Amino acid sequence: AWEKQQRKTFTAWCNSHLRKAGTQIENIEEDFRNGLKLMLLLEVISGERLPKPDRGKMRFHKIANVNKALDYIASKGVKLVSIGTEEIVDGNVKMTLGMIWTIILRFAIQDISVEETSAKEGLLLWCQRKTAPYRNVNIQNFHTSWKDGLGLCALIHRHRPDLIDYSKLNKDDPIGNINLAMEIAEKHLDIPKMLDAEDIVNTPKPDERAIMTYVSCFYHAFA
């Protein structure tokens, strides 16, 4: 169930940046094979210029573009262990997801710094701080603590109490709470809906990379 969740969230996330450059992806397992939109994604999120892309359709042109992407990422202190150009070009689902996770981590999460605490840990602390007043919320992690929708509704309410009546909410309708939160964030905070509520609720432990990805948008939307 983790691939399904990551596929939705990572794609939605990539799309939240690609739109700023006039394009989208649809199918993440194929839409980065040629390197073109992968390079473009890196430009948008970094604000840096990558080398000019190769629009040739053969494998060798794709390898060149993907290497422009991966070399750039490695220039930003990202150690690529088992992510390989050939398999991105050829189309490996797992590795594509992992590569996009690595970019999300580096560019959406790594630089989050809260009370001398950075990255995942720093994002976690910010969440805990913003949700401390909410007795029906207990953020310990980026999976089970977000399952019931209240964490997300609390982050919204904390910054924008005008968008949500939090006191009406409870644990009884986790699918509704998540959708509510995603609807408000989409409509008012310019954060596309990146989670499938159904997947999140119906799994003992939802995917933490996906959850982190989405929660990082709230962090950036508010700061």
Swiss-Prot record:
Span of the secretion signal? Answer: none
Q: Where in the cell is it found?
A: Cytoplasm, Myofibril, Sarcomere, Z line
Expressed in which tissues:
Expressed in both skeletal and cardiac muscle.
Residues in domain Calponin-homology (CH)? 4-108, 117-223
Free-text description of this protein's post-translational modifications in UniProt: Ubiquitinated by FBXL22, leading to proteasomal degradation.
Outcome when changing L97P: In MPD6; uncertain significance
UniProt region (Actin-binding), positions on chain: 1-220
- Where Phosphothreonine occurs, the residues are T203
Q: What does this protein do?
A: F-actin cross-linking protein which is thought to anchor actin to a variety of intracellular structures. This is a bundling protein.
Q: How does it assemble?
A: Homodimer; antiparallel. Also forms heterodimers with ACTN3. Interacts with ADAM12, MYOZ1, MYOZ2 and MYOZ3. Interacts via its C-terminal region with the LDB3 PDZ domain. Interacts with XIRP2. Interacts with DST isoform 1 (via N-terminus). Interacts with PARVB. Interacts with SYNPO2.
Q: Which family does it belong to?
A: Belongs to the alpha-actinin family.
Looking at the record, which disorder is this protein connected with?
A: Cardiomyopathy, familial hypertrophic, 23, with or without left ventricular non-compaction: A hereditary heart disorder characterized by ventricular hypertrophy, which is usually asymmetric and often involves the interventricular septum. The symptoms include dyspnea, syncope, collapse, palpitations, and chest pain. They can be readily provoked by exercise. The disorder has inter- and intrafamilial variability ranging from benign to malignant forms with high risk of cardiac failure and sudden cardiac death. Cardiomyopathy, dilated, 1AA, with or without left ventricular non-compaction: A disorder characterized by ventricular dilation and impaired systolic function, resulting in congestive heart failure and arrhythmia. Patients are at risk of premature death.
The name on file for this protein is: Alpha-actinin-2
Interval of the full protein contained in this chain? 35 to 257 of 894
